[PDB]
Nucleic acid binder design. Structure first.
Ligand SMILES: [K+]
Ligand SMILES: [K+]
Ligand SMILES: [K+]
Length: 180
DNA sequence: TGTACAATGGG
């Protein structure tokens, strides 16, 4: 019952689970956001992932869970200001893609937050294997993030199905690495 | 590349 860990569990416990309908709606928004981000990259000559990360950094203020173990830190503030500057200065026709991209990353963050409880339930099955509980959570969280990136809502499978696959993969890979 | 029943206290 690590104080910081107990506090994380308390915090993710307040995030309600998504209904099927909401799940589909968020996943749809993430897809649309990635397509818009592609367009912004073509227009600006900037890396898609760099655009995504900056757009994310600008929607985190409205987020429910701020510090999530295992998640990539925001880029340095100067990179943010610079890239956010270029995106904001784009012509009318392109600024709608920016709106769609912002909606997508806001949706991604929500979808991730609403599944942190699943990561924890799986992690509990892997304790005493060389990684601390907190470490299991960090690795599981990175599997969750990968799940979100590759999830295809059109297959009509529940998100928990695909996330479980990835969270186990990530945790198993981390355990095998620790072991050498 | 692709990785997919559901699973979020546990069984
Ligand atoms: K019961
Ligand atoms: K009970
Ligand atoms: K029961």
């Amino acid at each position: 019952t690590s104080d910081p860990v107990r506090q994380y569990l308390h915090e993710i416990g307040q995030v309600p689970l998504l209904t099927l309908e909401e799940e589909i709606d968020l996943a749809r928004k993430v897809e649309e956001g990635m397509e818009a981000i592609k367009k912004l990259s073509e227009a600006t000559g900037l890396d898609q992932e760099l655009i995504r990360e900056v757009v994310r950094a600008k929607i985190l203020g409205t987020a429910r869970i701020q510090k999530i173990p295992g998640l990539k830190e925001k880029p340095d503030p100067k990179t943010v200001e610079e890239v956010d500057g270029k995106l904001k200065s784009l012509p009318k026709e392109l600024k709608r893609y920016l709106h769609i991209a912002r909606e997508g990353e806001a949706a991604r963050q929500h979808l991730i937050e609403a599944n942190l409880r699943l990561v924890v339930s799986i992690a509990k099955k892997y304790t005493g294997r060389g990684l601390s509980f907190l470490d299991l959570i960090q690795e599981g969280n990175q599997g969750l993030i990968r799940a979100v990136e590759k999830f295809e809502y059109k297959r009509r499978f529940k998100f928990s199905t695909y996330a479980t696959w990835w969270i186990r993969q990530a945790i198993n890979r981390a355990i095998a690495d620790q072991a050498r």
